[PDB]
Amino acid sequence: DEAEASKFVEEYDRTSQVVWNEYAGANWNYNTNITTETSKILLQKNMQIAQHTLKYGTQARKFDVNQLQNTTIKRIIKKVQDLERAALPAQELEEYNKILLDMETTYSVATVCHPQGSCLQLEPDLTNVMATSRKYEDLLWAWEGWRDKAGRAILQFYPKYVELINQAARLNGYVDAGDSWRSMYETPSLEQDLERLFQELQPLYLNLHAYVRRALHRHYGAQHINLEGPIPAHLLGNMWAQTWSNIYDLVVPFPSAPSMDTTEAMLKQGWTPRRMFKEADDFFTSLGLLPVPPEFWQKSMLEKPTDGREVVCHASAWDFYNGKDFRIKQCTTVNLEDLVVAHHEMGHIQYFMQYKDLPVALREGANPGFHEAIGDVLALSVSTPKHLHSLNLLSSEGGSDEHDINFLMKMALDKIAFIPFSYLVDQWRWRVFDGSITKENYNQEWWSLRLKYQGLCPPVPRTQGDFDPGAKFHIPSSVPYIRYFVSFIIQFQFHEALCQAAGHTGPLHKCDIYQSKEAGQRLATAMKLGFSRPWPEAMQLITGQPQMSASAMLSYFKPLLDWLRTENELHGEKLGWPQYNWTPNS
Numbered sequence: 001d002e003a004e005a006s007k008f009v010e011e012y013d014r015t016s017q018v019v020w021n022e023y024a025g026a027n028w029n030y031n032t033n034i035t036t037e038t039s040k041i042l043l044q045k046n047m048q049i050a051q052h053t054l055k056y057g058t059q060a061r062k063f064d065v066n067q068l069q070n071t072t073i074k075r076i077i078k079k080v081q082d083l084e085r086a087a088l089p090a091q092e093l094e095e096y097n098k099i100l101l102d103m104e105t106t107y108s109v110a111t112v113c114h115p116q117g118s119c120l121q122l123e124p125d126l127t128n129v130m131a132t133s134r135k136y137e138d139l140l141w142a143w144e145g146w147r148d149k150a151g152r153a154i155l156q157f158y159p160k161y162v163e164l165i166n167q168a169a170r171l172n173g174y175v176d177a178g179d180s181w182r183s184m185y186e187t188p189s190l191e192q193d194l195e196r197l198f199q200e201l202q203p204l205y206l207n208l209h210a211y212v213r214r215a216l217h218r219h220y221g222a223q224h225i226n227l228e229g230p231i232p233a234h235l236l237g238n239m240w241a242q243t244w245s246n247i248y249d250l251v252v253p254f255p256s257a258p259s260m261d262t263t264e265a266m267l268k269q270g271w272t273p274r275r276m277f278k279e280a281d282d283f284f285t286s287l288g289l290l291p292v293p294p295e296f297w298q299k300s301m302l303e304k305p306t307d308g309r310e311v312v313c314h315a316s317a318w319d320f321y322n323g324k325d326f327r328i329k330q331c332t333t334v335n336l337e338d339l340v341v342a343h344h345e346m347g348h349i350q351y352f353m354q355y356k357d358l359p360v361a362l363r364e365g366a367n368p369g370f371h372e373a374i375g376d377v378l379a380l381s382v383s384t385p386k387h388l389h390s391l392n393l394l395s396s397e398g399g400s401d402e403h404d405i406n407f408l409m410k411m412a413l414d415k416i417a418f419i420p421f422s423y424l425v426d427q428w429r430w431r432v433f434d435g436s437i438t439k440e441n442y443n444q445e446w447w448s449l450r451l452k453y454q455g456l457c458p459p460v461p462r463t464q465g466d467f468d469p470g471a472k473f474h475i476p477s478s479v480p481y482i483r484y485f486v487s488f489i490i491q492f493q494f495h496e497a498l499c500q501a502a503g504h505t506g507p508l509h510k511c512d513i514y515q516s517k518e519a520g521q522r523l524a525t526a527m528k529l530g531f532s533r534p535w536p537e538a539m540q541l542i543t544g545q546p547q548m549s550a551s552a553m554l555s556y557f558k559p560l561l562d563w564l565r566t567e568n569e570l571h572g573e574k575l576g577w578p579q580y581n582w583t584p585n586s
């Protein structure tokens with residue numbers, strides 16, 4: 001009985017390594033080369049892996065997990081009982097794979113054109129406009145155009161996607177797909193825990209929002225910025241206003257303490273995408289962690305193709321389930337944002353390598369937020385003025401308080417501004433999945449959350465047929481998003497614990513854990529667990545305690561909170577958006 005269960009997981013592990021490796025290879029080839037051929041074979045390999053999943057998942061459901069004594073075997077078999085999309089009947093499974101593929105393809109090839117003019121892709125062209133234009137109308141053209149061409153074209157698929165992904169979830173014992181996604185955290189109190197963390201960060205976000213709104217008022221004019229209202233969503237330097245770092249030049253706390261633009265110095269010094277990933281590899285090995293294998297450098301796609309191929313340019317990391325082949329796919333641009341993304345993706349590779357000897361069912365992060373967090377932790381050290389100067393990307397600061405507050409603002413525009421966005425994406429999608437939001441009010445309920453959580457308003461009134469969620473990668477690609485909210489909270493917890501392990505004293509935001517073998521050992525022991533234990537055990541190994549907590553993130557930004565409160569009080573800012581119904585008159 002116990003011997004039958006052990007033999008089962010042994011056979012599942014052997015056969016899954018082969019099948020999953022074959023699937024990963026075919027998926028890699030569509031993603032690196034969107035064509036009709038690679039499309040069809042990807043859809044074919046989907047049927048091979050589904051057959052395997054159904055064979056073993058059906059066998060796994062014959063075990064009463066209640067009677068199994070070994071907890072590791074209990075845990076694997078319980079997981080194999082979830083067939084995911086392979087629970088669908090054959091006709092629905094084919095339709096679902098086709099719909100996912102059609103949504104991804106529609107998003108990846110959408111363009112925005114001038115009449116009798118050029119056509120712009122999202123990356124790099126429209127992203128560059130959002131980051132660098134300071135003209136209200138040119139930002140509006142890019143912001144509206146992308147929603148017109150990407151978002152509106154996803155709407156035709158999305159109701160059927162919702163129906164099929166919910167049906168698969170119900171066939172695996174869940175009430176809807178959002179219930180299935182939340183279950184990955186194995187935390188009954190998840191929704192309440194996340195709400196409490198969100199509320200703890202409101203003082204920082206409200207003060208940053210009010211300070212940035214004032215600066216936008218100065219640049220874009222009083223007729224276009226309501227000082228008691230929400231901020232127009234196209235003015236924050238980013239297509240989704242999810243990170244605000246590209247308008248640093250409009251909101252510098254101390255303009256008398258200017259700084260080299262990192263991106264500008266990288267190009268002046270001939271940085272290349274490969275050099276960016278080599279620096280990330282060196283940071284991991286400086287901690288005593290593992291280097292990426294030689295195979296990685298030969299097989300990864302670290303820059304957009306030059307030969308015309310359509311590709312998915314979205315940065316991602318790939319485990320091929322043989323313990324030796326790991327790869328990144330990134331349309332890397334030489335700038336600071338993509339330097340951080342490169343570290344993000346290398347953190348995934350490190351996790352793959354740390355848990356490669358576990359059964360494949362357990363080759364995942366302690367929870368999805370842990371997987372997204374590892375690389376971001378190291379990038380916090382990389383981003384310090386001290387580290388950037390050692391890369392010859394910044395002059396020496398010298399402890400200047402003005403430079404220090406300027407650095408904290410730059411970090412806040414990335415990290416604090418992202419918190420409400422990362423909260424609201426799946427607040428919206430959980431309610432689509434549970435039927436609270438129907439297709440009649442997809443877009444209206446999205447904007448109600450954009451207002452409630454981020455304090456933003458659309459610059460152009462939305463119309464019937466708009467589907468602005470469709471204009472954000474993770475929606476058509478069906479990638480859960482709450483993992484990034486969790487990641488952004490716990491990465492500061494991990495930074496604080498690793499800084500303490502390395503003996504750093506003084507303000508947390510001055511810490512750089514480069515070359516700390518003690519910090520590497522904390523990360524490695526936790527990453528080796530994979531998904532073999534509830535995630536509080538990995539939290540305990542890294543931080544010395546078992547809970548998610550915003551206290552580290554608050555500690556990191558405390559000098560900035562103090563400065564923002566004094567600055568906002570001086571100007572009499574009304575925090576929040578009491579005039580929440582304001583929208584642009586012109």
Ligand SMILES: *[C@@H]1O[C@H](CO[C@@H]2O[C@@H](C)[C@@H](O)[C@@H](O)[C@@H]2O)[C@@H](O[C@@H]2O[C@H](CO)[C@@H](O[C@@H]3O[C@H](CO[C@H]4O[C@H](CO)[C@@H](O)[C@H](O[C@H]5O[C@H](CO)[C@@H](O)[C@H](O)[C@@H]5O)[C@@H]4O)[C@@H](O)[C@H](O[C@H]4O[C@H](CO)[C@@H](O)[C@H](O)[C@@H]4O)[C@@H]3O)[C@H](O)[C@H]2NC(C)=O)[C@H](O)[C@H]1NC(C)=O
Nearest residue numbers: 006007009010013070071072073323356357358359360532
């Ligand atoms: C409950 O069951 C747990 C699982 O049992 C395991 O799976 C089932 C299905 C059967 O096959 C079992 O025979 C099998 O053991 C069980 O947890 C296991 O407990 C043992 C100890 O009793 C652990 O064994 C340790 O493994 C270390 C190395 O681990 C990996 O090393 C290889 C590569 O380096 C790897 O190949 C190997 O096998 C895995 O390979 C493939 C990779 O593709 C993978 O897919 C596959 O699933 C295999 O897992 C293995 O994983 C050793 O270092 C360690 O030796 C330690 O002690 C020595 C002194 O005696 C020291 O010299 C040395 O430094 C080490 O400290 C030891 O052999 C096993 O890792 C563990 N498995 C898991 C998943 O946790 C658990 O004990 C059971 N509980 C109870 C109460 O009985």
Ligand SMILES: Cc1ccc([C@H]2CC[C@@H](C(=O)O)N2C(=O)CNC(=O)[C@@H](S)Cc2ccccc2)cc1
Nearest residue numbers: 314315316317337338340341344345348477479484
């Ligand atoms: C500078 C920086 C750092 C981190 C990110 C993360 C967090 C926000 C989110 C986004 O940009 O909105 N973001 C990605 O998207 C990165 N990329 C993936 O997280 C991949 S690893 C997820 C994936 C994609 C496709 C298939 C499977 C998994 C963005 C920017």
Ligand SMILES: *[C@@H]1O[C@H](CO)[C@@H](O)[C@H](O)[C@H]1NC(C)=O
Nearest residue numbers: 029033034035036037038309
């Ligand atoms: C891209 O796809 C086409 C059609 O599937 C194929 O002939 C070609 O070899 C592929 N290119 C690469 C670089 O794999």
Ligand SMILES: [Cl-]
Nearest residue numbers: 240468469471
């Ligand atoms: Cl939007």
Ligand SMILES: [Cl-]
Nearest residue numbers: 368480482483
């Ligand atoms: Cl998630």
Ligand SMILES: [Zn+2]
Nearest residue numbers: 344348371372
């Ligand atoms: Zn990621």
